[PDB]
Amino acid sequence: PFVNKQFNYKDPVNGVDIAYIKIPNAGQMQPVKAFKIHNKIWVIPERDTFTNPEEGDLNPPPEAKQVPVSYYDSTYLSTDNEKDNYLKGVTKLFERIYSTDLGRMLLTSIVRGIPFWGGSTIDTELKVIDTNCINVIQPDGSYRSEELNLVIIGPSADIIQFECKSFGHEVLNLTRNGYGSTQYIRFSPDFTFGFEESLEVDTNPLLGAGKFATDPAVTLAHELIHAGHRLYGIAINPNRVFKVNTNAYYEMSGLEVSFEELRTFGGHDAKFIDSLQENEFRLYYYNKFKDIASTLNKAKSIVGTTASLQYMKNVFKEKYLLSEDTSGKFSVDKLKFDKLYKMLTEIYTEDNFVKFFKVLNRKTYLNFDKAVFKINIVPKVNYTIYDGFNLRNTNLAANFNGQNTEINNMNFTKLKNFTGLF
């Protein structure tokens, strides 16, 4: 299994994989209980009021002022039972993802995607960037810095606004310069979204109630794909967008969708990113990887006692799949770069995960949400690692009956309708 231990929220802290921690938000915060579910990956069963000091208010703004697609509940994830369920739900989703070859590939890339040690000012020393770590309270009450790649945390005020958040650098664009940074995914396994089986209905803002429910494993995978891009520092600047011209409703409102989202969804959506721009990005990131190979060649000393310069240089040789010549000078090979870049951007896509999970899902990112549902995937009678909602040898096994909220109505509680609100 991907997660070797079946953590219970109430398990006593041990200062190793169950501990109270603090994140480098450059601000003050009370320690929160976190769980390390796998090498380099932690889960914090708390609403995210930490990554963004200006978003520490879970209370919903005035009713006369709410986003069409948004859902607020200041009480969600405030009790121990909820946190226990959140932990188990997230764990089950990691297992479901890991149970597929594609998921195993993605998770392996994520674990290997350690944020680059580019925090030194002297180009002859290799040093870690402190915001790619968390402070763990040890048994003796002291804090110890631990590097990590991924953190799954509860959503902020808007419960359905799942997203990858990471701490920036004063000068470096860590998610776009090949370096990478620790990713915090705001996510919840306790809610899901309804979509429509007919493409003409799903892509229309005035039709459909949300008959089918999105499998939360796909939703998490989507965020993990973004995380993969960001950990390898090849995320596409959100300023680069597609001026949607394939949907009259998006058009009549001048709605634009970032290339990063189209890339992440994959399938036909990825084709809206023309060849010219696609090559521009590839070249840009290729040069960034070159800079990394160069910085490593200059490094003649390592900072800290955690690991040896030899170890870290190898850690990044493997992450970026660099080449090494007679002298030991690293360089980026075009073939290996294209292969890794392609893996992270074309193999790991939402559309491909749908194929592996064999579930019904939105056919394009360019659609309109219909509703948000409350769910409980923890009980095996409701959802499993192997079949999601479509339980084998039951009436829910075929035709995605498990995702059909009308047939499998006991597993879904519609909290809000979005159709017509756009």
């Binding site: 697609v69 359905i160 606004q161 799942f162 997203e163 979204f193 939703t219 989507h222 973004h226 998006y250 709605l255 969708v257 989202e261 990112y365 659609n367 309109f368 949400d369 756009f422």
Partner: peptide, 4 residues
Amino acid sequence: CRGC
């Protein structure tokens, strides 16, 4: 991000 989920999007619209």
